[PDB]
Amino acid sequence: EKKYIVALDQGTTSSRAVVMDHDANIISVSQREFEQIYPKPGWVEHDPMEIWATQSWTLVEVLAKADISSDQIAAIGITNQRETTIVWEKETGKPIYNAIVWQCRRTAEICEHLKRDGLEDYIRSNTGLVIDPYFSGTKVKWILDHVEGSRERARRGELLFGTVDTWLIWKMTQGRVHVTDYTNASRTMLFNIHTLDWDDKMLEVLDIPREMLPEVRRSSEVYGQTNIGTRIPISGIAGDQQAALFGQLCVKEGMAKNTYGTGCFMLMNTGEKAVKSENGLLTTIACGPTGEVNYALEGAVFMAGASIQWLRDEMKLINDAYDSEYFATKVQNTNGVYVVPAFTGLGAPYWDPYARGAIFGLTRGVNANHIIRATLESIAYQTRDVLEAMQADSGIRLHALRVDGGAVANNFLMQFQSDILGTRVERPEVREVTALGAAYLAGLAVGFWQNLDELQEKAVIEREFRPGIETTERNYRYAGWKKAVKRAMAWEEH
Amino acid sequence: EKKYIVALDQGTTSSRAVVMDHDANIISVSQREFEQIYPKPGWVEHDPMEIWATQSWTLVEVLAKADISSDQIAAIGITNQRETTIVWEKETGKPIYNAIVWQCRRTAEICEHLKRDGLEDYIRSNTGLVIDPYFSGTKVKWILDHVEGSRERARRGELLFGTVDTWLIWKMTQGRVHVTDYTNASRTMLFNIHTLDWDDKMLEVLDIPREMLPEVRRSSEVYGQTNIGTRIPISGIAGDQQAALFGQLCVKEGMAKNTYGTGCFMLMNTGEKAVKSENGLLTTIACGPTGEVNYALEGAVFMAGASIQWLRDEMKLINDAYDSEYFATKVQNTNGVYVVPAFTGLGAPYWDPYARGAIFGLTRGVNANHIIRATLESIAYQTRDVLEAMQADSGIRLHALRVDGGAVANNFLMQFQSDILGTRVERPEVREVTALGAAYLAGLAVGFWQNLDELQEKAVIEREFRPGIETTERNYRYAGWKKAVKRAMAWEEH
Ligand SMILES: Nc1ncnc2c1ncn2[C@@H]1O[C@H](COP(=O)(O)OP(=O)(O)C[As](=O)(O)O)[C@@H](O)[C@H]1O
Ligand SMILES: Nc1ncnc2c1ncn2[C@@H]1O[C@H](COP(=O)(O)OP(=O)(O)C[As](=O)(O)O)[C@@H](O)[C@H]1O
Ligand SMILES: [Mg+2]
DSSP states (O other): OOOEEEEEEEOSSEEEEEEEOTTOOEEEEEEEEOOOBOSSTTOOEEOHHHHHHHHHHHHHHHHHHHTOOGGGEEEEEEEEOSSOEEEEETTTTEESSOEEOTTOOOTHHHHHHHHHTTOHHHHHHHHSOOSSTTSHHHHHHHHHTTSSSTHHHHHTTOEEEEEHHHHHHHHHTTTSOOEEEHHHHHTTSOSBTTTTBOOHHHIIIIIOOGGGOOEEEOSBSOOOEETTOOOEEBOBOEEHHHHHHHHTTOOSSSOEEEEESSSEEEEEEOTTSOOOOSSSOEEEEEEETTTEEEEEEEEEESOSHHHHHHIIIIIOSOSOTTHHHHHHTTSSSOTTOEEEOOBTBOBTTTOOTTOOEEEEEEOTTOOHHHHHHHHHHHHHHHHHHHHHHHHHHHOOOOSEEEEESGGGGOHHHHHHHHHHHTSEEEEESOOOHHHHHHHHHHHHTTTSOSOSTTTTTTOOEEEEEOOOSOHHHHHHHHHHHHHHHHHHSSOSOO | OOOEEEEEEEOSSBEEEEEEOTTOOEEEEEOOBOOOBOSSTTOOEEOHHHHHHHHHHHHHHHTTTTOOOGGGEEEEEEEEOSSOBEEEETTTTEESSOEEOTTOOTTHHHHHHHHTTTOHHHHHHHTSOOSSTTSTHHHHHHHHTTSSSTHHHHHTTOEEEEOHHHHHHHHHTTTOOOEEEHHHHHTTSOEETTTTEEOHHHHHHTTOOGGGOOEEEOSSSOOEEETTOOOEEEOOOEEHHHHHHHTTTOOSTTOEEEEESSSEEEEEEOTTSOOOOSSSOEEEEEEOTTSOEEEEEEEEESOSHHHHHHIIIIIOSOSOTTTHHHHHHHSSSOTTOEEEOOBTBOOTTTOOTTOOEEEEEEOTTOOHHHHHHHHHHHHHHHHHHHHHHHHHHHOOOOSEEEEESGGGGOHHHHHHHHHHHTSEEEEESOOOHHHHHHHHHHHHTTTSOOOTTTGGGGOOEEEEEOOOSOHHHHHHHHHHHHHHHHTTTTOSOO
16 A cells, blocks of 8 residues: 655655655655845854744645655655754644754854863764764754753753754654654764763753753664654655765765765765774764664765856856866866865864865966866865765775766766776766665654665666776876865965 | 157057147157067067067157157157067068067966076075066077077177067168167166176176177267257157156155056166065166166066956957956955966066966856956955065055056956055056157157156046055955966966
């Protein structure tokens, strides 16, 4: 009867809803976009409500627009943006401040303090993280101390805190459930990760009442029922990345994928052990083959697809993301030009909040095409940057990188990437790899599936990009690239 | 009978022809553009022929489109781009290599050698120059050594060398005259400036045959006749700048002007005595009130209006030089962006053949308008850069700056300029200040005029810019600027 499953995707710039068949075919897609709030420079916010509305809209049209009824889909899977924080009035069921995006940089001050007070190591050690406005730890704080009663209510279990997922479930289940998963948990910077639980150190250090925290659960488990009707399950939950990692079926030690979207995230699975990055990465929680904790090596890159948007929206050198390849190919080379996409500081191995974007190597004969290209190239540089650490830590030579993400369509890109990595690059047949995950996770969590090895057929690499550039050629390039970076670091006067 | 005088101006990006009456009015102007060759990044050449050619026509036009006849003009004045080197077959009358433009950085290697043979002082001392690809000595060489028999023929007077002027005159006078004036001579880096003659040291050091050199003469004298006819005369030569200094009538100690065009040349008259820079400036030859030798302190800025061209032709952020003002005033500020126009290295006071162009402090809210603005701004910075050296060296506080050049039409610029300086800026009434120059010289040379007080009434300042920014603001900006610069130097790998 119940022939399908639903993947709910709460993205950085929109909400999506996806439907699959048993053969995991994409039956249908829905998707509204929602407003980006830059209260001020470096600041990003969302309307927890807007976020919500969308996502629901999504949910339904899917439904209708394909003419499926609540009576035919197993469960629901769920994926979302990862650091972005929410806090709301419970009773009221209203947010007491707009969602603060992972993107947002307001929590810098704080970050600085912490730094002082010799905590890096507790953090790195117990959170697998690092000090940076990225993670919600400080986000949360920022709110607390910015709102009045706040800490009281909070303390008196009055105020609720969530992560996209968290916040979603709440609504699904009308206030009934206040849970989250591990992956997602991880991300907060208030969660011991070999302990699988909140961490008082932080909790108090950050000064947060355990009262508003939510039940941290497994990624592939049943969390509740949604009477979207005809009560529907919620059995899936991951960070879009882990999500996608899962969907790429990197579901066991040394498997990795690089994702090319608004940003860049390359996760590598560390199986059951959590490995410590000595080279500027993140230690984080993933999914093992059942929705079960696993560990992962993570490189996060703030600007990727976004620079492209920049290009199109603020410089207006292009009209389409699409356009970029045509122009890039319009020239033979970057003409010596280098573009450092540190619009938001650096991160990745760098983690330099004072970096600022920069263009280098200008010469009279350089033109917009050259600038465009350079831009794309930067994306690859970045990706190599981390690849290298990954290997550093990992102690593993990937011979093939499996990618995914919106921009994995830019073939130029794709091939440039292979060329500079000196590695083979695999472009999967399907692309909604993320949803994939949450949908798996979900129905795996419902015995809609009794294995990975069923959906293992969805994993069909469509395109293999082999390197075609000379090793020299290769390092040549990379050199200047770093030359650049150095020059862009520490711009911001602190 | 003969009522007019013609100025011939061979510039970095275009040839020009200008006509004037006795009251020194601009009867008419002709003007054809010529291609800029960037054989390779940091390299710039011209087609001596295309020079020629385009310089040839303007003449005509100007004539013919005002219906003047060869019979009504006295002489002909000559101003040209100052360092650009040409070498050509004589019998044959053809270049044996494209013009190497002053901008061109190909001769840095060489330059490096010279540096390590401890010749800076001799240079500095006898030339008033500095070791840098700017000046021709090395250009010449570069050619020699890059062409086959070259030094023989050269050696057997087979080959001929000259600067633009030298090259024009040659053409003018079908092969009749091979001279140049001092100004222009100075610039070669092969002429002692206290001896007023070639200098063997140099000559041999660089291994140039005294054979292809040209008679060095006075700026205002009768060199020959042009049968453009109806034999017309040539009684005037000057490097463009020198020429505009005269036109500005800065004709005695402490008179300075800053010119704004393809580049930025700020000169200041040092009378009969040659002052020695200690602050990265140039000691060179100028015109005394009678077209007699004088000395000057010179600051050379490679990129200026040129970065605007860039914006418009390569980046295409605008359709008109014009447009720049509008867009810039479209924003309140450069939003932290800093642009370092080092497309052809740095130059005064820096003299960094390895610096390359750079954009800085990018941030996602940055737009094309900010870029635009930044660029202009960078022009004023640079200017400040030198102005202080100027004083550093001069030991003189200018209380006003007299400018001129294409770009002084840019009021925003102009204003911004006076703000960052902390000084009033004077925009004279007449703008063909250069042609003015050449004409005078040329005509002054022929009893077409018999005193610089005559023409003296043209110096009417039309607009005066006074600073509207606070002293702080001022240094605050400058600071970033310098910060910016630092980061752009030594890009190029040597
Ligand atoms: N073709 C091409 N080329 C290049 N580039 C490109 C393209 N397309 C697109 N692109 C890009 O991509 C991106 C998008 O894609 P994606 O969705 O996948 O990502 P995400 O992260 O998910 C965001 As959400 O989370 O906020 O939604 C963006 O950023 C753009 O820009
Ligand atoms: N408005 C405005 N704004 C800005 N800018 C401008 C304008 N107009 C113009 N401009 C500019 O300026 C310049 C012109 O002016 P001049 O003619 O004087 O220059 P030379 O010296 O001649 C070089 As050639 O000799 O090579 O031509 C050029 O470069 C442009 O860009
Ligand atoms: Mg000129």
